Amino acid sequence: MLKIILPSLMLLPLTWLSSPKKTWTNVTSYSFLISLTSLTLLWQTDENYKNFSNMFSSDPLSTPLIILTAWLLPLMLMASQNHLKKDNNVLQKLYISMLISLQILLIMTFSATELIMFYILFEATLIPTLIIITRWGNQTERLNAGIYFLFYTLIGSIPLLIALILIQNHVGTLNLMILSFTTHTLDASWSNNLLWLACMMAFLIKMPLYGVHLWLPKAHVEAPIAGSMILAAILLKLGSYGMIRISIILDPLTKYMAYPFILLSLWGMIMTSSICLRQTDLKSLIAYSSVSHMALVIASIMIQTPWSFMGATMLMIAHGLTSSLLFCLANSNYERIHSRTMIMARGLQMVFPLMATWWLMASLANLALPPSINLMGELFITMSLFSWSNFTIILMGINIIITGMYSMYMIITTQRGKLTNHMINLQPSHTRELTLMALHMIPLILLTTSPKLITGLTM
């Protein structure tokens, strides 16, 4: 997998060497094709995972993501052509390159055989992200948000560093292939009960768990649209990908060491879903929607039943695409409105007829409408959770009712009701804004036709 990567690196030379006026089209047009080369990995006509080479591999779980990581770079670069079009021609070429490095790094992290290669690349992604959030962040508080995003991930990260070096000594190689075909069975000691927490905690932090998710609402609030898309679509899912490949070892402990997180997540799912119900900042509501719909995932990567896992793989890819779509349209309202407040800007369909159709489809993806991969995902996690304990439906049942309420409230108070009297007149929709959306949903429609590709390792 060096075509999904080397051609990517070369994007950096192109963003720099290219003309200031033509820099945007060379980069966006080329990474669209970079995504097309990424599609070749999907050709698995057999079960055997595709070990491209010693360090680089792609199995069913990584492949559905590498393609998404390559896909969003085009979109990210199309959603940030407006803001970042007021810059000095060298601030742009830095932002474009920053976005380019994220997927170079993220493509490799999702396509990495050695778990510590994951760690080095895993924690590197913070550098590009922190720059995108802090340097171009509009609000006074991004310095703070950046600190929260760096420390919560970093304090979790050093325990994983110690744990992975620890298993290398215990087993003798951090190669995901071998670690899988070798006998690593923890022994339920008090210490192992700590190892397990060391490995999972760093992944559980960037996958916002109810206890440590305050970093994500603060980060996406002041982050520029491209950073918020990356955090929701690819960055948070780095934590999920890690939990799937790391729990191959630590096989016995999670049977009983998971209860704490599972309950934290399911109760967390309800409270995070509910506070979405009365949050005035739209970007705030989407972020907590992201916490709740990701709290379902940590509760399926821990129950560990075949269906959970691919419920997880289905939902992660699906929610990634949906969340961005929501964060992308939130930005389009923010740029004309100039405020994140949900109460202002009422009635837009009256003035932006189509964006409202995109808003409606994004919300229906947000809630579980049935001919969507989003529902298949939740339906499956719901099933397994029920298997874990029939009572789980109650808590995963209060979340579904709340999820319907906030998803439609975003449509009802942003895209319906009487028009706002006279905010700065809202200029019509650009074709870029609409495509950036179409590019998010057309793939959501196509993937829903053949869900098999994003089903995970389990199935």
Binding site: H83, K86, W136, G137, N138, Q139, T140, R142, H338
Partner: protein, 42 residues
């Protein structure tokens, strides 16, 4: 129409002073002379 908030004078002020997190007494501390030379003489 947007101005990512660049730091104003007040945000800058805190970083002055001989200690970032000033203590009740350490608050009295005064930034050392920029020239690295002091006024005392007698």
């Amino acid at each position: 129409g947007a101005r990512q908030w660049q730091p104003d004078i007040e945000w800058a002020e805190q970083f002055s002073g001989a200690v970032m997190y000033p203590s009740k007494e350490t608050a009295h501390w005064k930034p050392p002379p920029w020239n690295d030379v002091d006024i005392l003489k007698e």
